[PDB]
A = this chain, B = another copy of it.
Amino acid sequence: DGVGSSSGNWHCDSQWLGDRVITTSTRTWALPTYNNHLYKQISNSTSGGSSNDNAYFGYSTPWGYFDFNRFHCHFSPRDWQRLINNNWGFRPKRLNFKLFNIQVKEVTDNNGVKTIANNLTSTVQVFTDSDYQLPYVLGSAHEGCLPPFPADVFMIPQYGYLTLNDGSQAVGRSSFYCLEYFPSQMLRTGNNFQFSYEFENVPFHSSYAHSQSLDRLMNPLIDQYLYYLSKTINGSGQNQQTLKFSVAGPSNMAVQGRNYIPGPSYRQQRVSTTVTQNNNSEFAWPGASSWALNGRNSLMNPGPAMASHKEGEDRFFPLSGSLIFGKQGTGRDNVDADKVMITNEEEIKTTNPVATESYGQVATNHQSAQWPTSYDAAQAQTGWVQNQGILPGMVWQDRDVYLQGPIWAKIPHTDGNFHPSPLMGGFGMKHPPPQILIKNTPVPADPPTAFNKDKLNSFITQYSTGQVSVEIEWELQKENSKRWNPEIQYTSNYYKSNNVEFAVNTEGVYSEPRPIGTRYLTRNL
């Protein structure tokens, strides 16, 4: 408080240490009044008659929340380049959050002209759901995060949640949460808020690509001591059955015995960026490859981590198996392909199956020769495996993270799960960073001079602004490779252009021209 004194400082930089990097980000926010200080029941019926697949029931709250669950909220593009070009892995360790320099403004709109003035006695309520007693919405890749550019001023998003629904109706098991049922303190002028949190133990993210394929792990000079069936008939035919075996064999690497097999798969439809190569029909929902839950079909959005395309064809992408980001200024309804940025997980093709291909073939009958009678005899038949679950001896790589991608997600509190790495990429934790809720305290207008028991519905128009600072410490996994030839590194292009990539244009608009992965260095196996 006061002209000569502040309640907070700059705090925007990145410190690089031996095996640690500390990122600090500071932004200025604006928080309006949401829902006119009311809790409102919402459902699909309130927005027209939709399909059963899109039915929902929930509540909208007058609270707002802070979101920094994206990598660009903490790493500058140059800092991201340092991270991915020199480290085999990384993971968050602890975070520090600060709220300071609160300013509450009141707005009067009389006879057209609008006037904004300070309201020194107003308050802003902040609390953290450190016990995870509220629905968690930070793991759904929603907008409203801290802007990647530090100079941008952003709007705090409104907090809402969903519960159980039967169509547009609710059931007795549905839960209603009031955020005012959490501790409320009395504040004076000039206060600040801060808290700390420690990330639970998570595995390092694989920020590397494999220099070896799963089917090429053998010595290309030495035979195996195992045999494979190589011939079933002598050729010609009447009764020419036989059994011949052979050694494999660098010349027959396909039939060699192996200890491990590629990870699981779930077939996705293949779409070409060359529109003339696609079928002349409307297939976005019909060929979507989805999953069902309680009679509702939900798109198999990215899903299991699978290679986006086969080698030598980057023009193909799975229908809903890849993260698709929008370019700066891109609209929201029916935009062209040049307005969106489609990621591809081509690095994991060494261990994961191709998203648009079958996992393999399996036998579907018993081949048999003649034996008594004739029609009984049948040749060997095989069938395509379009979806394959986990099998012992399987290995796979998880989906890559991106500069514009999410960081963490909350593992659902269930009896069981398998490999709870979030399917959109990142670190899955049972106790992620808690949600931080914020709201302007309502200030009623002049009440009537005669008592009335009805709740007040006339408030002073107010909004608040301030600064938010988040600092995260990351642990680094160094690389000690013995590779002789130079590695692949992310780099800018020297060729001249009208604008500098990852900068502002003439109008002052910051833009990220392309997605940045983390898998540039290489390692064996």
This chain: copies in complex: 3
Nearest neighbor of A114 in chain B, beta-carbon distance:
B446
Q: Is the CB of B446 within 8 A of A39?
A: no
The answer to whether B484 and A186 touch across the interface, beta carbons within 8 angstroms, is: no
Q: Is A247 an interface residue (CB 8 A)?
A: no
Binds B, one of A24-32, A283-291, A393-401: A24-32
Interface residue ranges of A188-217 to B (CB < 8 Å): 188-192
**A114, A153, A441 interface centre (most CB from chain B within 10 Å):** A153
Inter-chain contacts of A182 with B (CB < 8 A): 10, 12-13, 482
CB distance from A494 to the nearest CB of B (A): 3
CB-CB under 8 A for A488 and B491, given A5-B191, A118-B119, A186-B101: yes
Q: How many residues of A contact B (CB 8 A)?
A: 162
Residues from chain B with Cβ under 8 Å of A42 in the complex: 506
Q: Which of B4, B102, B185, B493 contacts A4 (CB 8 A)?
A: B102
Q: Please, which residues of chain B bring their CB within 8 A of the CB of A77?
A: 484-486
A324 at the interface (CB under 8 A from B): no
Q: Which residue of B lies closest to A413 (CB)?
A: B525
Which residues of B have CB within 8 Å of A186?
6-9, 11, 98, 100-101, 192, 467, 469
In addition to A136-B524, A486-B491, 4 A-B residue pairs with Cβ atoms within 8 Å of each other are A3-B104, A13-B182, A34-B449, A176-B500
Given contacts A76-B181, A151-B37, A455-B154, whether A522 and B445 have CB atoms under 8 Å apart is: no
Among A141-149, A256-264, A335-343, A356-364, the one that faces the other chain is: A141-149
Q: Which residues of B contact A78 (CB under 8 A)?
A: 483-487
- CB of A187 within 8 Å of the partner chain: yes
Say whether chain A's binding surface is mostly helix, strand, loop, or mixed.
Answer: loop
Assess whether A344 is interfacial by the CB under 8 Å rule: no
Q: Is the CB of A500 within 8 A of B524?
A: no
A6–B180 CB distance below 8 A: no
Chain B residue at minimum C-beta to C-beta distance from A135: B524
Knowing A176-B502, A181-B13 touch, does A187 contact B151 (C-beta < 8 A)?
no
Q: Which of B28, B108, B152, B185 contacts A8 (CB 8 A)?
A: B185
Choose among B443, B492, B507, B525 the residue that contacts A487 (Cβ–Cβ < 8 A): B492
* Interface assignment of A481: CB less than 8 Å from any CB of chain B: yes
The 8 closest A-B pairs by CB, nearest first: A8-B186, A9-B185, A6-B187, A2-B189, A4-B190, A10-B184, A38-B508, A172-B494
Which A99-127 residues have a C-beta within 8 angstroms of B?
A: 100-105, 107-108, 110-111, 113-116, 118-123, 125, 127
Q: Output the least CB separation between A471 and chain B (Å).
A: 11
Binds B, one of A163-171, A228-236, A313-321: A163-171
